[PDB]
Amino acid sequence: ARVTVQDAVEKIGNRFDLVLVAARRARQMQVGGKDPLVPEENDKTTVIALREIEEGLINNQILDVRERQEQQEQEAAEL
Template sequence: MARVTVEDAVEQIGNRFDMILVAARRARQIAVQGKDPMVEEMNDKPTVIALREIELGLVNAHTLDADERQTVREREAAEIAAVAAIAEGRSL
């Protein structure tokens, strides 16, 4: 997909500025954090995948916030388990 139209994505989010922020966050999740795309990749870059996910209503600011909160909870639980293991005198 060489060209991407963003009108549908803008309609899903509400305005183009918020759409850019949501698309950037989602693209970063896919590219850097290794999150799996919710649509077929079709050899597209993470930004195009993010826009397609937004257009389909799969991603918005609320879903990204919820996903990030879940990631933080999981990370904190792992840290607590590691500290508990150290406190008990055993290693992971």
């Protein structure tokens, strides 16, 4: 369900931070530690990642915040 990545590039600049951010997000979803935010339309994890970029609910800041929060939650599992 994706032809042009143009609006994703409008969100994340430089055309290359896009590819690194979408790669990190699709690694989150493929190695199944995660689940998609926007619903999948039987798209591959790559295109769900790009549509998540296009809504603007994933970028490098959101990913770093969520990974730091995940590590905090994992550190809260010591007990």
